[PDB]
Amino acid sequence: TTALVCDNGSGLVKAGFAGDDAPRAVFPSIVGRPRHQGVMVGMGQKDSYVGDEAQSKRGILTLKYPIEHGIITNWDDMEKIWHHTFYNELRVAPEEHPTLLTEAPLNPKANREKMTQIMFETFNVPAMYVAIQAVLSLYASGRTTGIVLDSGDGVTHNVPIYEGYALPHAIMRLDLAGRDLTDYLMKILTERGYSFVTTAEREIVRDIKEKLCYVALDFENEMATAASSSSLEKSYELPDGQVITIGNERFRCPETLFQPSFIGMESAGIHETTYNSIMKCDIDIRKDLYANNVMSGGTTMYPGIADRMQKEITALAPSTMKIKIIAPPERKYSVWIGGSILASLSTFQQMWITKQEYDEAGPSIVHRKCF
Amino acid sequence: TTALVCDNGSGLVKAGFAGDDAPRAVFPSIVGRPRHQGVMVGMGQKDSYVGDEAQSKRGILTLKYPIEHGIITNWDDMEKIWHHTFYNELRVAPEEHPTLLTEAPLNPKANREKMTQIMFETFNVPAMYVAIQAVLSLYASGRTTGIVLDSGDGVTHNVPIYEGYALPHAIMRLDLAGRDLTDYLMKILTERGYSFVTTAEREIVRDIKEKLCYVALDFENEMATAASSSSLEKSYELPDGQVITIGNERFRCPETLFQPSFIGMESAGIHETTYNSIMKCDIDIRKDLYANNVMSGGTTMYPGIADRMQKEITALAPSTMKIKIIAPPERKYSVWIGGSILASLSTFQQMWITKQEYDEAGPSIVHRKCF
């Protein structure tokens, strides 16, 4: 039976059958529960809403994300998101379709085990696998060698790879991604009095972030230009028709990827952690990693982020190195496209966790087989 | 059928058909096995890389040499190097081509026996021979009389010969060669902080040794000049484009051939062991050995090594003796060229170990026929 690929990343679920070119279900990984009284009978007033249901009801629901920093914190609601994914969006019974899950690297083994338990005992799926998202992102780019930089909603991670052979000591994960960008955008939009505080408003500032923000090529000079002229200001219309206007916030928001100290995060920036990841690699392969930076994940979609990243690594890396960044279109879906490739690859059919292996070895099996 | 010459020296295999002017396969005698976790599909089915392939993948492989100090330590990998030599590089079936192997003198008889077993029972070769490398090095020069100095990757040896009649008591072997020079170059490059520790880095310091190093004509005055001026410093570019600069290390590395105490090796230097080898010879022939020092092997390629050797032996030898050193171009390949001559010499076709003789006498035959 045709395999099933379900990228339970943070923020958005991407799911669909293997071998398809694009995920046929993309919806937010949100569970919303009614915030107010239940005044009006004659309706189901149902206890919970998920995905686009929750977005369509946003302003009366306490929205929550059950996966946080790539870690599933709330299995009772994540199991609702998987139920919705399989039965309502994909409209398929998982007990016929082996499911390729995926997760970020350097992640608690309790997550991979609980995902295994849930898939094999709640959804009875015939087989399962848990690929590293960055490894998938090479499949989606046709590469066999490169650093992958995946930057999601909840986590950002670097994984260097060379003709296969991921270098596990050179993997880095940053815990800085689109939620920290949204919350910092809210904090700086407070500087001119657009008070956003509810999760519905957090979900609107996510849209403001996606529509308006871009990454400055030269942050000091863009900041000086936004200080000297209004040319960088853009206007946006809130759901109630209130216009807001935004200026240096427009690039100060995604700049925090390159300057995490803006959110008080101590770590090196994403360019510095990319360089330090290449510096953990053996000196022979670094030239091909510089020649094969692959960017993936939604927070790599900012205009100019590839240009800024190339400038910053060309400033870090030795002057001879041909720093190249593979940041294609649809790089937002590249982790799913890589799973769609891998799950439909003829040789991968050896790799599934069969339910017989789960009945023999319990949750511990998924540390033995999966990388 | 045209004979086959396969110089399984240390470090580089030189192989090719007899009668050719130069070996058509020259590649490193390296077997490399993956060091890291193979995460992608499209690997691991192949699990061992040989020769130039191991160099092309250097930074993910634990490179190993299966022949060490001219002694084959790892027959399972040496048999891979022979398989690669015959089937992938020369693209020939050995069961049609009698193979002239060669090895250093004063070498464990177990090696010559295991080479015989492998050639006659794994590769089924019609016939085989194991010439002493220094005896071969005369043929490439056209001498009948001379000192041969062979200085390889793993061993250095002196073999005096006079109209024939190698003097077996005057043979000397030093166990000091290009690997000890590489490792000492790594140790002294540590003195200014280029930490090389992996075998990939050992393989880069081999390149630094080949590109930059030279033999000082007057080591004390060259050391003082490198101390007083930067004129002797040279810059080299690592595979990742990091520039390094090298100074007195440039000649301190190959100086250890003349001063083995630099690597803690007790023995007399190569000039002293050359002189002592002539001094083991009968007093009538010494004048022609002084007139016919033949230098061969890759570690004789250093600029100025012939001039330094001539100075040192002219200081050792009696003032009348016309000390002359035959260090031609291509002396790196002179052992193979000598094998290409010998294997195609019509007088030599008596000398092969035939497979009938091996079926009659086992590995012991190669001590009876070969010198």
Binding site: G19, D20, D21, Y139, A140, G142, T144, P328, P329, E330, I337, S340, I341, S344, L345, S346, T347 | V41, G42, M43, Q45, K46, D47
Partner: peptide, 24 residues
């Protein structure tokens, strides 16, 4: 650079895995 489908990308890894299986 132009797009290429999941079919073509699969064909890349199929051809590579065949190449290594022949090399093995």
């Amino acid at each position: 650079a132009p797009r290429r489908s999941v079919g073509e990308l699969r064909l890349l890894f199929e051809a590579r895995c065949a190449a290594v299986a022949a090399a093995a």
